[PDB]
């Protein structure tokens, strides 16, 4: 997520109102940097462990 | 130059 | 930038005030090149006093 | 466009073209806009409805105006009678008049502009054929807007691309001929010249469309050897140079189109990149030449 | 006819093309994002309330146009400030066209990405952007 709130990468959807949409340009999602507390990420293996 | 030169072996 | 001397002080008051640059992205040397000639005092500051 | 055709002396596209010099660069240096083709017989069947809605709508400027001058008017005499009914000096009566006539004079003059307007927007569309330019984009955006159903125009090489592939040759090499057969030295001569490029055009089993490229290529490395100093320089032939100019320039225009952007950034780009190909393929033949030492 | 005629200098096509500026003295400029933003919102909204179509979805574009047609003029407003700051780093051996073409891409770039904010000048703003924008173009240049 965003690393701050309600911020795009690029500045596009910087705007406050802009909430729970992605922005095309940099293909990101805004909303608070609470979300950033709550989603994962999954490595992909080449190899079964 | 755009030119197209052939060479009209024929 | 500094209290005078004498002066009574009240708690939650400011003792001593400072200003603290803001984050801005840029080029080392070319920039650095440039931010020597222009652009001075062009960018934020934050209140840390 | 090929610098060596748009600056010849004689410049094959004008006379193939039928067109001035001056009106030829102006469109190679993204100048003034220029109609391509018109419907002219899809203009005629309504050529009178046309006429009737002008009148219309010159009549409906012709009421406003004339509204406008009936209130100024009557607040003018009210108020010259108010001061009269003070008794004032005859200078205030003066002053008062002649900033109500005036008032009005600057109404009827502007009624006068639209009006004038209107009549030029009539003439250069009632009068309107190809190879027509239009220097000042305020009309043309007018003319677009009020009537942009008929005449489609743009300004570019790629503008002159349509012109020439929808224009046929035989047609006017017969014209030509039939008019050579008459008289008229004058404008005999004209002809003449006229049709020997046409003729020339028909006889080359070839299409004018080359005149306009879309793939510049480019000379094999060798040939414009690339040369290390005891520093490792750049110093061979400036080939490299212009080549630099005119891919940089290209990328420019394509992520400038991708990004998105108003039309006079695009034209001032894209005029700039035409004089980078007229540059490459000849440096000199036509205003300042480039110099970097 | 077949008269030879002179050419005419880039430059001076570029003055022509802009004499039709007139800046707003930096004061209505605010309004004038007030309907960008509107605009960047209702063309999302208009996305997002694809579902809904009315009279009521052409009202949002209202909005819209005023927005595109309020941001052809905020692009218009900068051009004389872009070619000053342009023209003050000139002699390094670019064309000033080159320079001139690459702060229109920073101001481009920069205020479609910015908000009032009750920030620094818009003017400083592009000025800033403009000048990181040709000086990055210098330096790659070499
Ligand atoms: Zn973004």
């Given at each position: 997520?965003?690393?701050?709130?309600?911020?795009?990468?690029?500045?596009?959807?910087?705007?406050?109102?802009?909430?729970?949409?992605?922005?095309?340009?940099?293909?990101?999602?805004?909303?608070?940097?609470?979300?950033?507390?709550?989603?994962?990420?999954?490595?992909?293996?080449?190899?079964?462990? | 130059?755009?030119?197209?030169?052939?060479?009209?072996?024929? | 930038?500094?209290?005078?001397?004498?002066?009574?002080?009240?708690?939650?008051?400011?003792?001593?005030?400072?200003?603290?640059?803001?984050?801005?992205?840029?080029?080392?040397?070319?920039?650095?090149?440039?931010?020597?000639?222009?652009?001075?005092?062009?960018?934020?500051?934050?209140?840390?006093? | 466009?090929?610098?060596?055709?748009?600056?010849?002396?004689?410049?094959?596209?004008?006379?193939?073209?039928?067109?001035?010099?001056?009106?030829?660069?102006?469109?190679?240096?993204?100048?003034?806009?220029?109609?391509?083709?018109?419907?002219?017989?899809?203009?005629?069947?309504?050529?009178?409805?046309?006429?009737?809605?002008?009148?219309?709508?010159?009549?409906?400027?012709?009421?406003?105006?004339?509204?406008?001058?009936?209130?100024?008017?009557?607040?003018?005499?009210?108020?010259?009678?108010?001061?009269?009914?003070?008794?004032?000096?005859?200078?205030?009566?003066?002053?008062?008049?002649?900033?109500?006539?005036?008032?009005?004079?600057?109404?009827?003059?502007?009624?006068?502009?639209?009006?004038?307007?209107?009549?030029?927007?009539?003439?250069?569309?009632?009068?309107?054929?190809?190879?027509?330019?239009?220097?000042?984009?305020?009309?043309?955006?007018?003319?677009?807007?009020?009537?942009?159903?008929?005449?489609?125009?743009?300004?570019?090489?790629?503008?002159?691309?349509?012109?020439?592939?929808?224009?046929?040759?035989?047609?006017?090499?017969?014209?030509?001929?039939?008019?050579?057969?008459?008289?008229?030295?004058?404008?005999?001569?004209?002809?003449?010249?006229?049709?020997?490029?046409?003729?020339?055009?028909?006889?080359?089993?070839?299409?004018?469309?080359?005149?306009?490229?879309?793939?510049?290529?480019?000379?094999?490395?060798?040939?414009?050897?690339?040369?290390?100093?005891?520093?490792?320089?750049?110093?061979?032939?400036?080939?490299?140079?212009l080549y630099?100019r005119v891919i940089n320039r290209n990328?420019?225009?394509?992520?400038?189109?991708?990004?998105?952007?108003?039309?006079?950034?695009?034209?001032?780009?894209?005029?700039m990149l035409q004089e980078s190909v007229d540059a490459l393929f000849?440096?000199?033949?036509?205003?300042?030449?480039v110099?970097?030492? | 006819?077949?008269?030879?005629?002179?050419?005419?200098?880039?430059?001076?096509?570029?003055?022509?093309?802009?004499?039709?500026?007139?800046?707003?003295?930096?004061?209505?400029?605010?309004?004038?994002?007030?309907?960008?933003?509107?605009?960047?919102?209702?063309?999302?909204?208009?996305?997002?309330?694809?579902?809904?179509?009315?009279?009521?979805?052409?009202?949002?574009?209202?909005?819209?146009?005023?927005?595109?047609?309020?941001?052809?003029?905020?692009?218009?407003?900068?051009?004389?400030?872009?070619?000053?700051?342009?023209?003050?780093?000139?002699?390094?051996?670019?064309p000033?066209l080159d320079?001139?073409?690459?702060?229109?891409?920073?101001?481009?770039?920069?205020?479609?990405?910015?908000?009032?904010?009750?920030?620094?000048?818009?003017?400083?703003?592009?000025?800033?952007?403009?000048?990181?924008?040709?000086?990055?173009?210098?330096?790659?240049?070499?």
């Amino acid at each position: 997520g965003p690393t701050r709130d309600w911020e795009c990468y690029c500045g596009k959807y910087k705007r406050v109102r802009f909430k729970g949409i992605i922005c095309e340009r940099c293909g990101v999602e805004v909303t608070r940097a609470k979300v950033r507390r709550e989603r994962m990420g999954h490595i992909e293996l080449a190899a079964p462990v | 130059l755009c030119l197209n030169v052939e060479v009209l072996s024929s | 930038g500094i209290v005078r001397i004498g002066a009574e002080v009240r708690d939650g008051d400011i003792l001593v005030g400072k200003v603290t640059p803001k984050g801005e992205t840029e080029l080392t040397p070319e920039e650095r090149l440039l931010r020597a000639i222009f652009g001075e005092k062009a960018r934020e500051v934050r209140d840390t006093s | 466009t090929h610098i060596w055709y748009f600056k010849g002396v004689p410049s094959r596209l004008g006379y193939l073209l039928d067109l001035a010099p001056k009106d030829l660069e102006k469109i190679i240096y993204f100048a003034a806009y220029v109609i391509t083709s018109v419907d002219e017989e899809m203009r005629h069947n309504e050529l009178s409805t046309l006429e009737a809605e002008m009148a219309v709508e010159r009549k409906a400027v012709e009421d406003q105006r004339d509204g406008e001058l009936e209130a100024r008017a009557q607040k003018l005499e009210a108020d010259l009678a108010e001061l009269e009914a003070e008794g004032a000096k005859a200078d205030a009566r003066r002053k008062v008049r002649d900033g109500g006539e005036r008032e009005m004079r600057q109404i009827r003059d502007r009624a006068q502009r639209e009006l004038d307007r209107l009549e030029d927007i009539w003439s250069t569309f009632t009068k309107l054929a190809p190879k027509q330019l239009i220097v000042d984009e305020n009309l043309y955006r007018e003319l677009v807007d009020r009537y942009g159903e008929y005449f489609t125009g743009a300004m570019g090489a790629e503008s002159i691309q349509k012109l020439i592939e929808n224009f046929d040759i035989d047609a006017e090499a017969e014209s030509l001929r039939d008019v050579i057969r008459n008289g008229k030295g004058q404008k005999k001569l004209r002809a003449l010249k006229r049709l020997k490029v046409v003729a020339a055009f028909q006889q080359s089993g070839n299409s004018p469309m080359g005149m306009v490229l879309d793939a510049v290529p480019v000379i094999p490395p060798e040939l414009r050897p690339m040369v290390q100093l005891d520093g490792g320089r750049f110093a061979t032939s400036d080939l490299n140079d212009l080549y630099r100019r005119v891919i940089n320039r290209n990328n420019r225009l394509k992520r400038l189109i991708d990004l998105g952007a108003p039309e006079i950034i695009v034209n001032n780009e894209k005029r700039m990149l035409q004089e980078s190909v007229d540059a490459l393929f000849d440096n000199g033949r036509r205003g300042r030449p480039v110099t970097g030492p | 006819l077949d008269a030879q005629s002179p050419a005419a200098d880039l430059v001076r096509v570029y003055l022509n093309g802009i004499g039709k500026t007139a800046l707003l003295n930096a004061a209505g400029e605010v309004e004038l994002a007030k309907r960008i933003e509107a605009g960047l919102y209702a063309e999302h909204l208009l996305e997002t309330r694809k579902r809904l179509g009315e009279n009521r979805k052409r009202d949002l574009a209202a909005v819209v146009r005023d927005g595109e047609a309020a941001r052809r003029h905020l692009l218009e407003a900068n051009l004389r400030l872009v070619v000053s700051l342009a023209k003050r780093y000139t002699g390094r051996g670019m064309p000033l066209l080159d320079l001139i073409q690459e702060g229109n891409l920073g101001l481009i770039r920069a205020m479609e990405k910015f908000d009032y904010t009750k920030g620094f000048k818009f003017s400083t703003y592009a000025t800033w952007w403009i000048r990181q924008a040709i000086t990055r173009g210098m330096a790659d240049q070499s």
